[PDB]
Amino acid sequence: PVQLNLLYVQARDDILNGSHPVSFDKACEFAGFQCQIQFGPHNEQKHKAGFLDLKDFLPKEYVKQKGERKIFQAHKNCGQMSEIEAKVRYVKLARSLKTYGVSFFLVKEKMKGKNKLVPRLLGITKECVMRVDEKTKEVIQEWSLTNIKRWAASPKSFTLDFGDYQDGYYSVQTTEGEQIAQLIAGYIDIIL
Amino acid sequence: APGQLECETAIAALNSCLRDLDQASLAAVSQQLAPREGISQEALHTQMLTAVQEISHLIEPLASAARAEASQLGHKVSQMAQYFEPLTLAAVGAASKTLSHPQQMALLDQTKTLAESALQLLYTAKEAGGNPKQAAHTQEALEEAVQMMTEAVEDLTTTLNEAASAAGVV
């Protein structure tokens, strides 16, 4: 229909502006479908070397990463696919990722057994809380909301208590603990 | 189940010390850690220094027992665990009597780190059991756990001195 363009624009914009954080590889695959959309079917003679301005095709954190090559592989791989469906495979691919429609906060964790803070993406959905790598965007751990028993925000931190689901609270340094808590408190009220 | 029950209990007790440390931090981070009365800063720091030194002296012997002697491992882990209850109590009291909030948090955090490293030592030591036929993956993990505890002891110790100096504790 026409919805598919509105949806495409929205999924696409979220990845470009960083609201939907994705791995480099996926960024590129997305860029591949965006090329198919904006440029039609790939052509090795036109779609060349400095043909793309990467700042309109990748999230800011990946522009200086030298991605043209693999954006072009993902573009080639589309072939004579049409805008309409290229747009749909993008929206499908986005939907396919565990990061899709998660609210994310950049926090800091203390490494277990070490006096060292690491940056970390903490994500909150409907269903779960998840720890995600700042660089790779790997989902390194998830907890169901149903396993969260208590929580507390301060102006400097946020802390979860999973009760007898695991040993140890999970706790992060953040200036956004209140928002994080309101998100989670909302979702858990809703599950009733 | 030779030395293995001692590991389980030891591990459970460290898990418990760590929850007390997270409560103190939570309370602390929101400026509601009431200073503990009935006891001097001197005696708390003395409690903390002692327990740390004894934990430190126990790391290699524990590690070595895990590479060979199942019976001995069971005794060394329970030894190592006994020290953590008093350390945790002392650390929460000391922190509560510390005036500078950053220094109060550093005591708690570094004590947490040490308990965490102890926990990992215990996991890898329990996996090793007495049995020397453990894999080199168990060997490398244990040596790492040991190295991690040693650095934790180093860090907390320094932080102990600094806090001591701020509080005139001698």
Curated annotation (Swiss-Prot), chain A:
Disulfide bonds: none
Occurrences of domain FERM (ranges): 1-192
Segments of this protein annotated with the region Interaction with LAYN: 72-192
UniProt-annotated location(s): Cell projection, Ruffle membrane; Cytoplasm, Cytoskeleton; Cell surface; Cell junction, Focal adhesion
Subunit structure: Part of a complex composed of THSD1, PTK2/FAK1, TLN1 and VCL. Interacts with THSD1; this promotes interaction with PTK2/FAK1 and VCL. Interacts with NRAP and LAYN. Interacts with SYNM. Interacts with ITGB1; the interaction is prevented by competitive binding of ITGB1BP1. Binds with high affinity to VCL and with low affinity to integrins. Interacts with APBB1IP; this inhibits VCL binding. Interacts with PTK2/FAK1. Interacts with PIP5K1C. Interacts with F-actin. Interacts with SVEP1.
Function noted in UniProt: High molecular weight cytoskeletal protein concentrated at regions of cell-matrix and cell-cell contacts. Involved in connections of major cytoskeletal structures to the plasma membrane. With KANK1 co-organize the assembly of cortical microtubule stabilizing complexes (CMSCs) positioned to control microtubule-actin crosstalk at focal adhesions (FAs) rims.
Free-text comment on this protein's domains from its UniProt entry: Consists of an N-terminal FERM domain linked via a short unstructured region to a large flexible C-terminal rod which contains 13 amphipathic helical bundles (R1-R13). The rod begins with a five-helix bundle (R1) followed by three four-helix bundles (R2-R4). These are followed by a series of eight five-helix bundles (R5-R7 and R9-R13) in which the N- and C-termini are positioned at opposite ends of the bundle, creating a linear chain. The four-helix bundle R8 does not disrupt the chain because it is inserted into a loop in the R7 five-helix bundle.
Protein name: Talin-1
Organism: Mus musculus (Mouse)
